[PDB]
Amino acid sequence: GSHMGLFNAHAVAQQRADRIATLLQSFADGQLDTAGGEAPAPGYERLYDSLRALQRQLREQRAELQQVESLEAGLAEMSRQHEAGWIDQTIPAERLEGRAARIAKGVNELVAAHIAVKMKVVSVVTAYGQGNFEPLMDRLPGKKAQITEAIDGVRERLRG
Amino acid sequence: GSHMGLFNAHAVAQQRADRIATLLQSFADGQLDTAGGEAPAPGYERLYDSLRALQRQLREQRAELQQVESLEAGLAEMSRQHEAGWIDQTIPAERLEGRAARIAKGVNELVAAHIAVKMKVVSVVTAYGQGNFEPLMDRLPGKKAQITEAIDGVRERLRG
Ligand SMILES: [Cl-]
Ligand SMILES: [Cl-]
């Protein structure tokens, strides 16, 4: 409450500000591990609340970007496997979660559809390759129509 | 420098703390638009530096999660298009960037490979469907080997 009082106040305010600066710094440097601890006094309660709120967020967002890194990893893996013909490989969707998992599942099902059209073609053409000319290629939509009529083309030939 | 001085110091420190709390709050609520402005005094310079550093980060991370939202969008679109047979559709990789763009390109090329094996099959089977038995299905790796030998199967039949 004198001059020494005012100086001391500032010395303290300065320090409070300093640890807060340290926390925000270990937040920019991905160290969301250390909780800020208790506020030093009433005047900083809200700030510290926002500090935790900011931590909880910086955390989630980090997890999500991570997932996305696993996704690009598994996709890469799946691509490698498929070029080599190991077409039963898929991005391990289970290991992922959230947005990343959805994307992963989308990719697997998208390829699955394409692969299915081949399993059929490979089939009703295997039969055609050994006499049986009974089966027909499934009617396919849009530009996949070709496949359906190219298999029908070879069906006429063999027939007769 | 008296009692009124100490009180005033605290009134100020309290306020400084308050705006800082407001900034960190509009950072948790995705409002990374407002720069903190200048520090109120030396003791808060570093803290404000970390405040900007934290803003620049919260920004980037938001952009990335966004990209990932476009990605899941385009993938969805591509899936819709393909089920309907519009197999020339692709995730618009250009509109994206960073990790998301890479993933998008991966997905497009992964499907492209699968589609290519079909373009060939549809071809060397169209020929087989109209007399020509000269062309051969390309030797394929792993489990795609089937396709290559199922087309060879029907090649023998037609031949002779
Ligand atoms: Cl291999
Ligand atoms: Cl349509």
Numbering used by the authors:
A (entry chain A), B (entry chain A): -2 to 157
Give verbatim excerpts from the published study on this entry:
HAMP domains are small modules, approximately 50 amino acids, that dimerize to form an entirely parallel four-helix bundle with two helices (AS1 and AS2) supplied from each subunit. A semi-structured connector separates the AS1 and AS2 helices and contains two conserved hydrophobic residues, termed HR1 and HR2. Aer2 is a soluble receptor that contains three N-terminal HAMP domains, a gas-sensing, heme-containing PAS domain, two additional HAMP domains, and an MCP KCM. The three N-terminal HAMP domains of Aer2 (named HAMP1, HAMP2, and HAMP3 from N- to C-terminus) provide examples of two distinctly different conformations: HAMP1 and HAMP3 are similar to the Af1503 NMR structure, whereas HAMP2 has a comparatively distorted four-helix bundle structure in which the AS2 helices approximate a two-helix coiled coil and the AS1 helices splay outward at the C-terminal end.
Crystals of L44H and V33G proteins were obtained in the context of Aer2 1–172 using conditions similar to those of the native protein. V33G crystallized in the same space group as WT, but L44H produced a different crystal lattice. The V33G mutation locally destabilized the connector around HR2 and increased mobility in this region of the protein, as evidenced by decreased electron density of the connector in the region of T31–V33. These changes had no effect on the helical positions of AS1 and AS2 compared to the WT structure, which is consistent with a HAMP1 conformer generating CW output. However, the increased flexibility of the connector and loss of the V33 side chain for packing into the bundle core should affect the ability of HR2 to stabilize the HAMP2 structure, and thus we expected this substitution to disfavor conversion to a HAMP2-like conformer. Compared to H1, H1 V33G had increased CW bias in CheRB+ cells and was also CW locked in CheRB− cells. Temporal assays confirmed an inverse Asp response by H1 V33G, in that Asp caused a drastic switch from 16% to 100% CW bias. The mechanism underlying H1 V33G inverted signaling is not completely understood; however, it is clear that a branched hydrophobic residue at HR2 is important to achieve the HAMP2 conformation and CCW signaling state. Stabilization of a HAMP1 state by V33G is evident by the effect of this mutation in the CheRB− background, where it produces an exclusively CW state.
